[PDB]
């Protein structure tokens, strides 16, 4: 009873994992952009403070 | 017997997905720490402009 109930949850993990990996793959693409633009903003802000 | 032939491969597909996620999971863990300190610095740099 526990096993074949778990088999329902087990395929849901496979469904979660592919979708979650694509969601992360999309947001690393964004977090590639975030890292450079925030660094550019941070330097220029210090130059203005001087 | 018919079940666990496929379920052994279905376990393999989960193991592949979790291991692939793990490679990313360590890296996003680091990129949480990198983001938190940068977010704190980026906010604090702007607060004195109030």
Swiss-Prot record, chains A, B:
Disulfide bond sites: none
Compartment(s): Cytoplasm, Myofibril
Function statement: Muscle contraction.
Domain writeup: The rodlike tail sequence is highly repetitive, showing cycles of a 28-residue repeat pattern composed of 4 heptapeptides, characteristic for alpha-helical coiled coils.
UniProt subunit comment: Muscle myosin is a hexameric protein that consists of 2 heavy chain subunits (MHC), 2 alkali light chain subunits (MLC) and 2 regulatory light chain subunits (MLC-2).
Family in the record: Belongs to the TRAFAC class myosin-kinesin ATPase superfamily. Myosin family.
Protein name as it appears in the record: Myosin-11
Native source species: Gallus gallus (Chicken)
UniProt gene name: MYH11
Shown part of the complete sequence: 861 to 910 of 1979
């Amino acid at each position: 009873q526990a096993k074949d109930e778990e088999l329902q949850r087990t395929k849901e993990r496979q469904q979660k994992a592919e979708a979650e990996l694509k969601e992360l793959e999309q947001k690393h693409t964004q977090l590639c952009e975030e890292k450079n633009l925030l660094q550019e903003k941070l330097q220029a802000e210090t130059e203005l403070y001087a």
